[PDB]
Motif scaffolding. Structure first.
Motif, PDB file in Angstrom:
ATOM      1  N   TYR A 146      -2.423  -1.279 -63.557  1.00 42.97           N
ATOM      2  CA  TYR A 146      -2.968  -1.211 -62.193  1.00 42.97           C
ATOM      3  C   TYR A 146      -2.704   0.192 -61.674  1.00 42.97           C
ATOM      4  O   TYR A 146      -1.538   0.611 -61.470  1.00 42.97           O
ATOM      5  CB  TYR A 146      -2.360  -2.262 -61.274  1.00 42.97           C
ATOM      6  CG  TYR A 146      -3.036  -2.179 -59.937  1.00 42.97           C
ATOM      7  CD1 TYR A 146      -4.344  -2.619 -59.806  1.00 42.97           C
ATOM      8  CD2 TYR A 146      -2.452  -1.487 -58.899  1.00 42.97           C
ATOM      9  CE1 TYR A 146      -5.020  -2.471 -58.602  1.00 42.97           C
ATOM     10  CE2 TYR A 146      -3.083  -1.380 -57.663  1.00 42.97           C
ATOM     11  CZ  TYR A 146      -4.373  -1.856 -57.534  1.00 42.97           C
ATOM     12  OH  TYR A 146      -5.025  -1.743 -56.338  1.00 42.97           O
ATOM     13  N   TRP A 147      -3.804   0.923 -61.478  1.00 38.00           N
ATOM     14  CA  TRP A 147      -3.749   2.390 -61.231  1.00 38.00           C
ATOM     15  C   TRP A 147      -4.571   2.745 -59.986  1.00 38.00           C
ATOM     16  O   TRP A 147      -4.615   3.919 -59.650  1.00 38.00           O
ATOM     17  CB  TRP A 147      -4.303   3.121 -62.465  1.00 38.00           C
ATOM     18  CG  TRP A 147      -5.587   2.555 -62.994  1.00 38.00           C
ATOM     19  CD1 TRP A 147      -5.721   1.743 -64.087  1.00 38.00           C
ATOM     20  CD2 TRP A 147      -6.898   2.665 -62.416  1.00 38.00           C
ATOM     21  NE1 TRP A 147      -7.016   1.366 -64.253  1.00 38.00           N
ATOM     22  CE2 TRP A 147      -7.759   1.907 -63.226  1.00 38.00           C
ATOM     23  CE3 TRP A 147      -7.416   3.354 -61.304  1.00 38.00           C
ATOM     24  CZ2 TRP A 147      -9.113   1.826 -62.948  1.00 38.00           C
ATOM     25  CZ3 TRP A 147      -8.763   3.261 -61.031  1.00 38.00           C
ATOM     26  CH2 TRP A 147      -9.587   2.483 -61.833  1.00 38.00           C
ATOM     27  N   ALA A 148      -5.127   1.767 -59.265  1.00 38.30           N
ATOM     28  CA  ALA A 148      -6.075   2.124 -58.178  1.00 38.30           C
ATOM     29  C   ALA A 148      -5.290   2.828 -57.064  1.00 38.30           C
ATOM     30  O   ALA A 148      -5.840   3.667 -56.311  1.00 38.30           O
ATOM     31  CB  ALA A 148      -6.860   0.920 -57.710  1.00 38.30           C
ATOM     32  N   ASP A 149      -4.012   2.492 -56.916  1.00 40.14           N
ATOM     33  CA  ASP A 149      -3.148   2.952 -55.817  1.00 40.14           C
ATOM     34  C   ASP A 149      -1.720   2.792 -56.335  1.00 40.14           C
ATOM     35  O   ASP A 149      -1.489   2.000 -57.243  1.00 40.14           O
ATOM     36  CB  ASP A 149      -3.456   2.139 -54.544  1.00 40.14           C
ATOM     37  CG  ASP A 149      -3.379   0.632 -54.759  1.00 40.14           C
ATOM     38  OD1 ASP A 149      -2.249   0.078 -54.704  1.00 40.14           O
ATOM     39  OD2 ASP A 149      -4.449  -0.031 -55.003  1.00 40.14           O
ATOM     40  N   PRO A 150      -0.760   3.627 -55.935  1.00 41.23           N
ATOM     41  CA  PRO A 150      -0.974   4.696 -54.958  1.00 41.23           C
ATOM     42  C   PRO A 150      -1.671   5.966 -55.454  1.00 41.23           C
ATOM     43  O   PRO A 150      -1.831   6.168 -56.639  1.00 41.23           O
ATOM     44  CB  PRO A 150       0.467   5.042 -54.553  1.00 41.23           C
ATOM     45  CG  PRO A 150       1.269   4.733 -55.794  1.00 41.23           C
ATOM     46  CD  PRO A 150       0.618   3.551 -56.442  1.00 41.23           C
ATOM     47  N   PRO A 151      -2.157   6.847 -54.576  1.00 42.95           N
ATOM     48  CA  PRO A 151      -2.940   8.019 -54.992  1.00 42.95           C
ATOM     49  C   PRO A 151      -2.310   8.909 -56.079  1.00 42.95           C
ATOM     50  O   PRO A 151      -3.015   9.276 -57.009  1.00 42.95           O
ATOM     51  CB  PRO A 151      -3.090   8.772 -53.660  1.00 42.95           C
ATOM     52  CG  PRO A 151      -3.120   7.676 -52.635  1.00 42.95           C
ATOM     53  CD  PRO A 151      -2.110   6.662 -53.113  1.00 42.95           C
ATOM     54  N   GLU A 152      -1.027   9.211 -55.992  1.00 44.68           N
ATOM     55  CA  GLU A 152      -0.342  10.092 -56.966  1.00 44.68           C
ATOM     56  C   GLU A 152      -0.387   9.446 -58.356  1.00 44.68           C
ATOM     57  O   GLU A 152      -0.618  10.130 -59.351  1.00 44.68           O
ATOM     58  CB  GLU A 152       1.109  10.382 -56.557  1.00 44.68           C
ATOM     59  CG  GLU A 152       1.800  11.349 -57.509  1.00 44.68           C
ATOM     60  CD  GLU A 152       3.195  11.843 -57.162  1.00 44.68           C
ATOM     61  OE1 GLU A 152       3.977  11.037 -56.649  1.00 44.68           O
ATOM     62  OE2 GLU A 152       3.520  13.016 -57.514  1.00 44.68           O
ATOM     63  N   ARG A 154      -2.582   7.293 -59.395  1.00 45.33           N
ATOM     64  CA  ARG A 154      -4.012   7.321 -59.818  1.00 45.33           C
ATOM     65  C   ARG A 154      -4.318   8.697 -60.428  1.00 45.33           C
ATOM     66  O   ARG A 154      -4.966   8.749 -61.513  1.00 45.33           O
ATOM     67  CB  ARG A 154      -4.883   6.991 -58.600  1.00 45.33           C
ATOM     68  CG  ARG A 154      -6.365   6.927 -58.919  1.00 45.33           C
ATOM     69  CD  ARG A 154      -7.149   6.659 -57.655  1.00 45.33           C
ATOM     70  NE  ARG A 154      -8.564   6.401 -57.926  1.00 45.33           N
ATOM     71  CZ  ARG A 154      -9.194   5.259 -57.737  1.00 45.33           C
ATOM     72  NH1 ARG A 154      -8.591   4.203 -57.208  1.00 45.33           N
ATOM     73  NH2 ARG A 154     -10.493   5.167 -57.972  1.00 45.33           N
TER      74      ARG A 154
END
Ligand SMILES: Nc1ncnc2c1ncn2[C@@H]1O[C@H](COP(=O)(O)OP(=O)(O)OC[C@H]2O[C@H](O)[C@H](O)[C@@H]2O)[C@@H](O)[C@H]1O
Length: 209
Positions: A146-152, A154
């Motif tokens: 799961y990579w959608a968030d957080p931005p860093e 991602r």
DNA sequence: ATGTC
């Protein structure tokens, strides 16, 4: 506590099976600017246009389109965009191959490379030449499912390993595939090029969405 | 969960 890089350090290049004949005919992956005889684009054009003009600030320089791109993970965010039909390409993930090698194989072969700590078109991406600098990458982000968030997380999941101009087919150690059907089609293609290395073809559904 | 930014 934070994950380190495996050694050898796998690198992954995804491509449509319709490009495999051209890879074997050339005997190599060719960078975008080297005019590969690709049959099927699975890219975003609008981000391709950024790669086209993105300067690589480490020798041997040039732009991102002068390098064959790899990620340090399978099951990339790019593969999600493909799986979900967000790309102009509408074929989905099943015909997408993961071509696997290692950073260390490239170094030992004396091929020029650079790598990044995050999605390479980002103006704040860091670029490296020394394999000891694999310690600068975020291996938790690279392995995250799961990579959608957080931005860093991602950004850092999409750290790239970049090989200048061409990547010889002889350095590919594995072709991973989604399905038995695609595995079989890969072996049929490989057998048309009997002088070429035949890497193990492995069904790895956990590398897909 | 996630449609490369
Ligand atoms: N000899 C070959 N014959 C056939 N196809 C080849 C060959 N060598 C390379 N290809 C394919 O030719 C193509 C070379 O394009 P590039 O730019 O490097 O890779 P991308 O298109 O995946 O772009 C990544 C995108 O991810 C994000 C942005 O939107 C980027 O634009 C690939 O399919 C290669 O496998």
């Amino acid at each position: 506590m934070k994950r380190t890089y495996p050694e050898p350090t796998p690198i992954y290049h995804i491509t449509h099976i319709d490009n495999l004949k051209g890879i074997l005919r050339m005997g190599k992956l060719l960078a975008h600017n080297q005019s590969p005889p690709k049959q099927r684009s699975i890219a975003y054009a609008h981000i391709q246009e950024r790669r086209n003009r993105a300067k690589v600030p480490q020798p041997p320089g040039g732009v991102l389109h002068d390098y064959v791109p790899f990620y340090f993970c399978p099951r990339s965010p790019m593969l999600y965009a493909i799986y979900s039909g967000a790309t102009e390409y509408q074929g989905g993930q099943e015909p997408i191959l993961h071509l696997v090698s290692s950073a260390q194989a490239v170094h030992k072969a004396g091929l020029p490379f650079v790598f990044t700590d995050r999605h390479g078109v980002l103006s704040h991406a860091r670029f490296f030449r020394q394999l000891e600098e694999l310690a600068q990458l975020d291996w938790e982000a690279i392995q995250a499912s799961y990579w959608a968030d957080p931005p860093e997380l991602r950004e850092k999941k999409q750290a790239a390993f970049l090989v200048y101009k061409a990547f010889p087919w002889a350095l590919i150690e594995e072709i991973a595939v989604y399905s038995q059907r695609v595995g079989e089609e890969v072996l049929k293609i490989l057998k048309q090029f009997p002088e070429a290395r035949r890497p193990r073809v492995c069904i790895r559904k956990d590398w897909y969405y």
